[PDB]
């Protein structure tokens, strides 16, 4: 309810792998929901210079 996943609409907790769409919509998306591998996720967390965007925002 507070942080609805942009795909499954379920709650995005602190102990779950999730990524914010800094590209536009500013919504949180579960890593698993977006179909992102743990390897991609870890690198994205490591790269402060990288900005991620959801399929919806990127298709705009």
């Amino acid at each position: 309810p507070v942080y609805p996943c942009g795909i499954c609409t379920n709650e995005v907790n602190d102990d779950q792998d999730a990524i914010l769409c800094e590209a536009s919509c500013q919504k949180w998306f579960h890593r698993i929901c977006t179909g992102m591998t743990e390897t991609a996720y870890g690198l994205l967390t490591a790269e402060a210079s990288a900005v991620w965007g959801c399929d919806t925002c990127m298709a705009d």
């Binding site: 792998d17 914010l20 800094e22 967390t45 900005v51 991620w52």
Partner: peptide
């Protein structure tokens, strides 16, 4: 990229 891993 901003992630929950923090």
């Amino acid at each position: 990229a901003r992630t929950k891993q923090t």
